[PDB]
Design a protein around this ligand. Structure first.
Ligand SMILES: CC(C)CCC[C@@H](C)[C@H]1CC[C@H]2[C@@H]3CC=C4C[C@@H](OC(=O)CCC(=O)O)CC[C@]4(C)[C@H]3CC[C@]12C
Ligand SMILES: CC(C)CCC[C@@H](C)[C@H]1CC[C@H]2[C@@H]3CC=C4C[C@@H](OC(=O)CCC(=O)O)CC[C@]4(C)[C@H]3CC[C@]12C
Ligand SMILES: CC(C)CCC[C@@H](C)[C@H]1CC[C@H]2[C@@H]3CC=C4C[C@@H](OC(=O)CCC(=O)O)CC[C@]4(C)[C@H]3CC[C@]12C
Ligand SMILES: CC(C)CCC[C@@H](C)[C@H]1CC[C@H]2[C@@H]3CC=C4C[C@@H](OC(=O)CCC(=O)O)CC[C@]4(C)[C@H]3CC[C@]12C
Ligand SMILES: CC(C)CCC[C@@H](C)[C@H]1CC[C@H]2[C@@H]3CC=C4C[C@@H](OC(=O)CCC(=O)O)CC[C@]4(C)[C@H]3CC[C@]12C
Ligand SMILES: CC(C)CCC[C@@H](C)[C@H]1CC[C@H]2[C@@H]3CC=C4C[C@@H](OC(=O)CCC(=O)O)CC[C@]4(C)[C@H]3CC[C@]12C
Ligand SMILES: CC(C)CCC[C@@H](C)[C@H]1CC[C@H]2[C@@H]3CC=C4C[C@@H](OC(=O)CCC(=O)O)CC[C@]4(C)[C@H]3CC[C@]12C
Ligand SMILES: CC(C)CCC[C@@H](C)[C@H]1CC[C@H]2[C@@H]3CC=C4C[C@@H](OC(=O)CCC(=O)O)CC[C@]4(C)[C@H]3CC[C@]12C
Ligand SMILES: Cc1c(CC(=O)O)c(=O)oc2c(C)c(OCc3cccc(Br)c3)ccc12
Ligand SMILES: Cc1c(CC(=O)O)c(=O)oc2c(C)c(OCc3cccc(Br)c3)ccc12
Lengths: 703, 703
């Protein structure tokens, strides 16, 4: 049974009775001293962190990993070259550079990445942001045949990717890799759904084989839809039907692969065996002159010389570069986190940012585009049996083999099989659409975040949609605690349990005592509402009572000066039957005098202010004689709430009702001590430990 | 003394023992029914709210107000015409329209405003924002002698003010007048400081009588500084010296007016006598040909015909219109709130928005600009003795008299005495600069908001700086609770008081029990940090323990299948001296099997998992056998934190350690019931009332 026999504490007698350890809080000098205190072990640890490869390469086990690693590397390399060919078209650049986006960063990641399962490269939505940023750049560059336009587009892509990599490297160096926590789960869901719809709309111009002008940021998806639906009559029926059949069978075989896992190890690489089928069917049968199907151009073999990034493209695409870098880092961290949790190894987000930045910089310098890990490719690599990043090495080797020697294949490719392959990974993100119902029935509040994120992204394009969604998500925090369900507490069962005042039957509030609870932190957006709710719950504005008391005191002093009232130690003689009620109206610049606290030290009679006054003065009465604030859920006050709380406490103290604050820990009172909260009026003895402690102290003091 | 004797409760037995009132929460149908249920009393109340004038005109007391009201009206009218002349110059439009901005809205406010002390009109910040919006509008309008430029500027000003009034009216209709609470006190202070610097820089082109191009939003103050400092040699020494002397005398007299209040009622109207002596000195002595001082042009008497607002200017300045409307409403509410608190009358924010919108619309339709209440003018009107809005009527009457009959005056005005008068009321706002020190020594977190607001406003111009600062402040809200000071609790004095684990000496944690406290709400930005801190405090990742236990069970089952181990009710025979340790490496797509909950029902021996296992299995031991989460400060969980909490609770329950949640009220458990938090695993019996209740229940269950 709950049995306690302790003295009543008030966090002041408690501090005296129980001494503290007196821990020294960390200053600013010692922090700098300890981070700047270089040591050989610290240097070795920081170097190993900056070069994670040396951490695990000597620890590689050469018996149970090589076969699985090489198989996964081959499979992920094939899927990576196919995905690069598909994704390079989203930027309206020649597909050759796609191989670079699937080759250069991954190699760099091998020597700087900390994860062990993801497969670095391009993923479709990042490619779409690259394309949007490029279309913005070329349309804004001041001017000083189509191959020239393609070359300037690829130059813009390289520049934008180099700047994105520079931004990622700068973020990683500054050790601000904790930014990824500002993106909620609901915002991520909404962004994934909107991105799914965006990629579905953007692949249409390849499924139908039409020509669309490169649209811009303000409203992109709807413009692409309009321009692609205005020219249905100019479609290619053969390309449409082949895209539909390959997409349908790819989805079917993906469903079979997901359904059958135990009986089917090393899942069927339908992508390779089907791109080869499409290539073989196109070859010989000539789906380039018998039909008018667009075909991937002749691949020019060999690498390309690096080009310095353009300063003008840096200047014109800064905000979109910030956006693309943040999206890339967030996607990579979210993809790697699941595998890290599954296999239980440490993950360094900041090192991930550094590796991504270096990979992006290297790839962009060599005419590629921004890269990360792709969920579909990473899932393929892991499920095939990927163990370490050596699978990434084998994938890069396969991509290099394709880009160097085996390049005249994939040349008769249908240029729509790639689009269907890219869009076939849309099952998860589109099926995620069934999240409005769950959130609405669950929380009714994160559903608002999801819907607003979806609408904002769809309207604004992913460059600005993410930022607007983040702003709205941050605003929803203030929205949640904008109107706290402030309540009045009361005793239950004549014990030390206190609950809401409209929830039970055998309740008993102590006489002249009202207990208030505000179950949310009080900051700039809450102090007004908290003050209004507290005043309404109490039943009277303390300032009004104080002003009325001051006016009554002034009237009494005036009557005493006129001699109509004689001051006695007990009461007054009141040598008047009835006065004419010559109430005075105080002008401006003098009403503030009524705000001052009342001190009747001159008058021997201690006026009760609650029974009655001579000559029938107003003097409104108050039954409440003590107030306890249940600050058990208050988590932080900064400035405005502190000023409001100080004003409220001064107002209550001045009308001669004590106020007690209950439930706060030592950290809260320590923090409040800095705000100059305490002074000659609001002492430090108003803080207590538990509501029952406060009420017991009140009862002891009163009688 | 603190005496209590009650049974141990767990918010489930407590619910059964103490029945609830069963209050019916308001639905969506009843809310609509009650707001749509029109009633004659409700209609009368809503009409009186929509026309607050009829509320107080019959209640006017024509014995003690009329003299003070008329005096205040005359004084505020003189100061209002002077201020309008000064402020209209900030928009680079002829000063005539300034009178309109000081006349039209105020009259409208008389029939729609609810405040009783403020004086409606233009204030220099709103004029500057109008000027910036106009300069943006004319520079962006597609094209289809100097007076034509002035006429198009005034047309743009009228259009932008009409749109701002429309926005204000729309906001007031929608009853969203609570937006004004999103602006903290620190943000307000920073904005006022930056705006003081802005007005000081923008009055320079009049302080010296030069010519400056109308700069734009991106960086305005610095551009004006450069273009005004490149032409110091083209100044007017007479204008400079006269502006300096009028500034000096007005500052000195303001100082003596603040210092001397009791001995000097109805404060000296220094502005009126100063401008009249400046005009008299200019007249006759001809400060227009003896010197080259720019003067106010010949006033064209009479009103002007209304012009329809321009659609092109409407669409070109939507965002700046939103910004100016919000700034105007916030300024008016902040100015009126102080007086409402001083005189204790009801104040309606939504009605204030409606009145401001109607006034702005009427003024803009009649060729004026945006209007609000100015702190200087309102303070003058109140301190002179203003009692109600009739003083506003008298001020509007004086302005009308000036604009109709006495208009040839103020023509020999010096066009810099007005600038000096406008800038002389800046001391009380520039003295806010000494707020960085107070905040830094006080809170160290709102000082960041103040500095960021100052920098953002200075760099970006007010219209964008306000929005950027609001976004940063909303981000700071998350910043405060991004890294909660998570702590471990322990008993104090062998009683029901629990405190931090590094703050006392005679502490006693119960055996195998760790109590965790997270003193901040857990949302998307906190669940990862909370989980990491909790796991670190406990000392082991539960998932690792569960996986190792599952691996050990699989190995034991394999040995039993091979027959090397014989299962007995107590222990095993273990018919092997030592095995070769043929540890198996589980491949991918099968590791998740180790994640499944443990269930050794088939084996009769209940494995303790803490003493020892045959054949020297790893099986890490855990001393902790019960965990209590002090959810006394948790205020809200939405989705992501709920998912993380469910995962953590499942992980802990599966490794056979009970988990209890303590301190939450009925509202929190009711809310958590919706998130599908409870199921067959995490029952509803894990919630308790107090930490001592939880530990007492643990002790009772254990022994
Ligand atoms: C609060 C929620 C609803 C988000 C706010 C939505 C606005 C930011 C969107 C909605 C409608 C959009 C407009 C809809 C149509 C157009 C026309 C469009 O012009 C073209 O047709 C350009 C063609 C070309 O040059 O290729 C330029 C963007 C614009 C003004 C859009 C700008 C962005 C707007 C205002
Ligand atoms: C979230 C809120 C804003 C509700 C969404 C409303 C939509 C139904 C509206 C808002 C913006 C509108 C679009 C604004 C601009 C365009 C582009 C316009 O096409 C062009 O300008 C032609 C391009 C060219 O040929 O250069 C066709 C109409 C369309 C898709 C509009 C279709 C209807 C849209 C999507
Ligand atoms: C976390 C921080 C450190 C990352 C910021 C990214 C910088 C590495 C980028 C972003 C803005 C870039 C600048 C944007 C604009 C210019 C002006 C440009 O000057 C010109 O020659 C202008 C050309 C013209 O306008 O005619 C020189 C490069 C520079 C400094 C850029 C250099 C690279 C900068 C600093
Ligand atoms: C995330 C935190 C830790 C750092 C964020 C820093 C950025 C918000 C700032 C830092 C420097 C800024 C840049 C400084 C200089 C320039 C060049 C500027 O271009 C010009 O100088 C144009 C001049 C002309 O047109 O005459 C465009 C803005 C930009 C890219 C700025 C963009 C915003 C930047 C990257
Ligand atoms: C991160 C915090 C601390 C500061 C916020 C950074 C940006 C929001 C600001 C800082 C520097 C600003 C830039 C500074 C200089 C210019 C040049 C300016 O162009 C001119 O001055 C053209 C006129 C002329 O120079 O003749 C256009 C705005 C711009 C790009 C500014 C845009 C807004 C920027 C990037
Ligand atoms: C704390 C940081 C983030 C912001 C403050 C930095 C300032 C010291 C810099 C940043 C942008 C600069 C401005 C960028 C552009 C211009 C416009 C330029 O206007 C002109 O007349 C240029 C044309 C010419 O004179 O040839 C004058 C300098 C100025 C105000 C610069 C002055 C110095 C500024 C304000
Ligand atoms: C729900 C509440 C918050 C409503 C708030 C009001 C504003 C959002 C409305 C009121 C007036 C509206 C404007 C009134 C007139 C027009 C002209 C209209 O026509 C054009 O400018 C296009 C034709 C052309 O090119 O001339 C475009 C929308 C716009 C700017 C409107 C945009 C939306 C505004 C600002
Ligand atoms: C704050 C909440 C309560 C309401 C938010 C509404 C605004 C953010 C939206 C609603 C309607 C929008 C307007 C709808 C239409 C247009 C016309 C658009 O111009 C064009 O379509 C130009 C097309 C061309 O030039 O061909 C410019 C933006 C604007 C004013 C939009 C600006 C953003 C507005 C005011
Ligand atoms: C394009 C894409 C694909 C297509 C493919 O990989 O083939 C996918 O499968 O998953 C995605 C996921 C899960 C995404 O969310 C990650 C995220 C985390 C934090 C902030 C933000 Br913003 C985004 C974003 C894009 C994709
Ligand atoms: C122009 C101006 C003058 C000049 C004069 O009247 O002579 C003044 O004296 O005070 C001001 C104050 C105190 C201002 O802050 C009010 C505010 C409240 C809430 C949000 C925001 Br954003 C702003 C804004 C402008 C002025």
């Amino acid at each position: 049974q709950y049995i306690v026999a302790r003295p009543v504490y008030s966090t002041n007698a408690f501090e005296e009775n129980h001494k503290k350890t007196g821990r020294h809080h960390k200053t600013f000098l010692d922090h700098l001293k300890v981070c700047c205190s270089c040591s050989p072990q610290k240097a070795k640890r920081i170097v190993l962190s900056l070069f994670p490869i040396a951490s695990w390469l000597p620890a590689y086990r050469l018996k149970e990993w090589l076969l699985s690693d090489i198989v996964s590397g081959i499979s992920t390399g094939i899927v990576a070259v196919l995905q690069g060919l598909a994704f390079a078209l989203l930027v309206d650049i020649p597909p050759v550079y796609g191989l670079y986006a699937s080759f250069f960063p991954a190699i760099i990641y091998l020597f700087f990445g900390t994860s062990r399962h993801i497969s670095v490269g391009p993923f479709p939505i990042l490619s779409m942001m690259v394309g949007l940023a490029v279309s913005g750049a070329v349309s804004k560059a001041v001017p000083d045949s189509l191959l020239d336009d393609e070359r300037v587009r690829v130059a813009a892509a390289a520049s934008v990717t180099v700047l994105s990599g520079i931004i990622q490297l700068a973020f990683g160096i500054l050790r601000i890799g904790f930014v990824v926590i500002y993106l909620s789960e609901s915002l991520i869901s909404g962004f994934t759904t909107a991105a799914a719809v965006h990629v579905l709309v953007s692949q249409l111009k390849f499924i139908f084989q039409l020509t669309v002008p490169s649209h811009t940021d303000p409203v992109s998806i709807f413009k692409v839809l309009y321009s692609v639906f205005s020219q249905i009559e100019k479609t290619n029926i053969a390309d449409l039907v082949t895209a539909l059949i390959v997409l349908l069978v790819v989805s079917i075989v993906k469903e079979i692969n997901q359904r059958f896992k135990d009986k089917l190890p090393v899942p069927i690489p339908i992508e390779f065996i089907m791109t080869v089928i499409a290539a073989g069917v196109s070859y010989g049968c000539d789906f380039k002159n018998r039909f008018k199907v667009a075909v991937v151009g002749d691949m020019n073999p060999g690498f390309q010389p690096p080009i310095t990034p353009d300063v003008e493209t840096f200047q014109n695409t800064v905000g979109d570069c910030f956006g693309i870098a943040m999206v890339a880092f967030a996607v990579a961290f979210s993809v790697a986190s699941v595998y890290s949790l599954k296999y239980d190894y440490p993950l360094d987000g900041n090192q991930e940012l550094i590796a991504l930045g270096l990979g992006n910089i290297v790839c962009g310098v060599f005419r590629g585009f921004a890269g990360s890990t792709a969920l579909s490719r990473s899932a393929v690599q892991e499920s095939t049996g990927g163990k370490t990043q050596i699978a990434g090495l084998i994938g890069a080797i396969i991509v290099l083999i394709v880009v160097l020697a085996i390049g005249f294949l994939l040349a008769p490719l249908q240029k729509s099989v790639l689009a269907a392959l890219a869009l076939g990974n849309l099952k998860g993100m589109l099926m995620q659409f069934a999240e409005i119902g769950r959130l609405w029935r669950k929380d009714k509040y994160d559903c608002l975040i999801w819907i607003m994120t979806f609408i904002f992204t769809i309207v604004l394009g992913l460059g600005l949609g993410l930022a607007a969604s983040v702003a709205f998500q941050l605003l929803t925090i203030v929205f949640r605690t904008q109107f706290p369900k402030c309540s009045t507490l009361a005793n239950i069962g004549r014990t030390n349990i206190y609950k809401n005042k409209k929830d039970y039957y055998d309740m008993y509030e102590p006489e002249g005592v009202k207990i208030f609870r505000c179950p949310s932190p009080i900051y700039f957006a809450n102090i007004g509402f908290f003050r209004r709710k507290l005043i309404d719950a109490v039943g009277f504005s303390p300032l009004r009572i104080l002003r009325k008391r001051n006016k009554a005191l002034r009237k009494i002093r005036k009557l005493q000066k006129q001699g109509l009232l004689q001051v006695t130690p007990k009461g007054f003689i009141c040598t008047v039957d009835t006065i004419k009620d010559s109430d005075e109206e105080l002008d401006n610049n003098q009403i503030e005098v009524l705000d001052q606290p009342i001190n009747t030290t001159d008058l021997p009679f201690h006026i009760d202010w609650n029974d009655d006054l001579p000559l029938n003065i107003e003097v409104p009465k108050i039954s409440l004689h003590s107030l306890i604030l249940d600050f058990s859920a208050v988590s932080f006050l900064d400035v405005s709430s502190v000023r409001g709380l100080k004003s409220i406490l001064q107002e209550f103290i001045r009308i001669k009702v004590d106020v007690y604050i209950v439930g706060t820990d030592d950290d809260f009172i320590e923090k409040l001590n800095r705000y100059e909260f305490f002074d000659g009026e609001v002492k430090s003895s108003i803080f207590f430990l538990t509501i029952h402690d406060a009420v017991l102290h009140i009862l002891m003091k009163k009688d």
